[PDB]
Amino acid sequence: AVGACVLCNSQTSLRCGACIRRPFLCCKCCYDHVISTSHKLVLSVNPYVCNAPGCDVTDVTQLYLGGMSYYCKSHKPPISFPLCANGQVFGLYKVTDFNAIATCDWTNAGDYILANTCTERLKLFAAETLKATEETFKLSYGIATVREVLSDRELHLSWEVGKPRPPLNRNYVFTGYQIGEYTFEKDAVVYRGTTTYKLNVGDYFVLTSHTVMPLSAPTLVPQEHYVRITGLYPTLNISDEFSSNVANYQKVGMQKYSTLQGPPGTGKSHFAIGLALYYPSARIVYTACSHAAVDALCEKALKYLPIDKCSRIIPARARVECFDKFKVNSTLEQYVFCTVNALPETTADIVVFDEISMATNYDLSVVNARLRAKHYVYIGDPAQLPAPRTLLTKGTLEPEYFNSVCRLMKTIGPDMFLGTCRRCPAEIVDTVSALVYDNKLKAHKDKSAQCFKMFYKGVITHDVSSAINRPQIGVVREFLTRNPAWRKAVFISPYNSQNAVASKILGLPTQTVDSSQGSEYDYVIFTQTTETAHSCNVNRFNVAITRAKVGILCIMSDRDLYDKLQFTSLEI
Ligand SMILES: [Zn+2]
Ligand SMILES: [Zn+2]
Ligand SMILES: [Zn+2]
């Protein structure tokens, strides 16, 4: 019952009982909270409630200290002090932004803006409160009791009446009943059990509600600049392959943390792994939120770093298959490849945090909490996709509010910028360079003359809310008959249900924009599907068209993004 004031650190016995996280508040700040919000329950060793038998007054503003106990106006003795007076709440050791964070429901973009422009201790309160709210919201959805099992990849479901039905995408991972995690796709539904199990009829699914642990460490440790490379020993023999990155590698050694903005195909993996070869004795933990981001860092390490000094950390509650060519769960190897949520408690010379646009402030804090390191390197791109905010339905979250690193990158600039895209035909590089990189991204490749755009609104049907555009798929089917080189193309759209239809009609492999992030393919076919905020988001569009190494076909719904594409227009 004794702790520090989440606003000014001052010791107190006073927690707010109305805040979902029950933060410790000092007398001066607990007042400014209760007097300006619907929050009136103040906890101590014992709650600030009327001690009179049967009295239900819990509002600290209506309570008084009578000797040792607390009473309301109706019950207090003649000699009694009001608990709230003179800008304080009586406690031992005797905020506008804190109020907005503490009370918001996290459905509005402005909630995320504030959780990212506030003080550092408020960024942790914000992140804890948000994640708790996200988790206690999951308790508010319908169960899917299995009616019948068609095959090993399809079954039918009966849905609980009175509670809403959650979106059936790869984003929403259920828990079967403890028959392991289970996802679904687009009355025949496509079931995907993490553990292979002959699905029993009557068995029920419920969503994976995890307990939100408190945060302690800041999002970003305080910044230190050094005169010389600190606690790292560079090679003199550095392979020409990594000669480009030498000055940035010395920058990494000469400050506590560094930010690298690398646009698509600019050499992020190359940079991350090239750091190990430039500081060859340095212990490096390689971390990202997703298994796929960590597995990409593994593939690059496999090519350049000795395989005996590399470990892939895999949590015993295995969710999806991941990188299988390192020693598994050897925490003490020089090179450790681990998702944030599985990180062990250890130390390092360098921590490399990759795909930083997908990190939340909760993720940034957990890393600083589990890994004590001489240098933190933050790699990603604020022009790429953020983590989905399940509760955010109103307003759009701008890149400068994704997390503390993206905010730094969007305000003061990144410490290091990889400025040459080596993956994409020039037509794509020129488009995104102007769209999201203020003309600072340069093309290595020539124009491919295999980058095509077509303006075709088509017809938009919906599977619930997920959009489908069959005529857009029809246009692709026609294009494929005349363009056999594209038979190998990955189909990409902003919608699962569009992808499900494209899968059956075209037989192409299928990716959402969001699942395509970090991947590259020779040929991409993109159907915008709709002109919504979701399908027109410049970050999503940037990711969509930068997957392609040789050619891209964009069937567009939005005039603006269509006119911006520096592609050959097709007719029909
Ligand atoms: Zn305070
Ligand atoms: Zn409160
Ligand atoms: Zn009373």
Q: How far is Cα 512 from Cα 458, in angstroms, rounded to an integer?
A: 19
The architecture of the domain spanning 426-564 is: 3-Layer(aba) Sandwich (3.40)
**Binding residue positions for a ribonucleoside 5'-triphosphate:** 262-269
Contact 279, 233 (CB under 8 A): yes
Contact 379, 268 (CB under 8 A): yes
CA of 172 to the centre of ligand 1 (A): 39
CA of 39 to the centre of ligand 2 (A): 5
Q: How far is Cα 280 from Cα 468, in angstroms, rounded to an integer?
A: 51
Of 503, 549, 554, whose CA–CA distance to 525 is shortest? Answer: 554
Beta strand 310-312 with 335-339: parallel, antiparallel or unpaired? parallel
Residues 6 or more apart from 189 whose CB is under 8 A from it? 154, 155, 156, 157, 168
Using CB atoms within 10 A of its CB, is residue 128 exposed (0-12), middle (13-18) or buried (19+)? Answer: buried
Q: How far is Cα 91 from Cα 46, in angstroms, rounded to an integer?
A: 12
For the chain, report the end-to-end CA distance as a whole number of angstroms.
71
CA of 407 to the centre of ligand 2 (A): 27
CA of 18 to the centre of ligand 2 (A): 5
Method: X-ray
Task: Name the closest ligand to CA 6.
Answer: 1
Contact 116, 403 (CB under 8 A): yes
Q: How far is Cα 265 from Cα 298, in angstroms, rounded to an integer?
A: 17
CA of 7 to the centre of ligand 2 (A): 12
Q: How far is CA 356 from the centre of its chain?
A: 8
CA of 24 to the centre of ligand 1 (A): 9
3-state DSSP assignment of residue 549: strand
Discontinuities in the chain (C→N > 2.5 Å), after residue? 94, 177, 186
Residues of the chain by 3-state class (helix, strand, coil), percent to 5: 30, 25, 45
Cβ atoms within 10 Å, residue 211? 6
CA of 31 to the centre of ligand 1 (A): 9
Cβ atoms within 10 Å, residue 292? 17
**Binding residue positions for Zn(2+):** 5, 8, 16, 19, 26, 29, 33, 39, 50, 55, 72, 75
Contact 122, 67 (CB under 8 A): no
Task: Name the closest ligand to CA 76.
Answer: 3
Full strand arrangement of the beta sheet holding 69-72 = 69-72, 63-66, 80-82
Task: Name the closest ligand to CA 74.
Answer: 3
**Binding residue positions:** 5, 8, 16, 19, 26, 29, 33, 39, 50, 55, 72, 75, 262-269
Task: Name the closest ligand to CA 62.
Answer: 3
Beta strand 327-328 with 205-207: parallel, antiparallel or unpaired? unpaired
- What resolution in angstroms does the PDB record give? 1.8
| Tokens coding 14 | 């006073």
CA of 168 to the centre of ligand 1 (A): 44
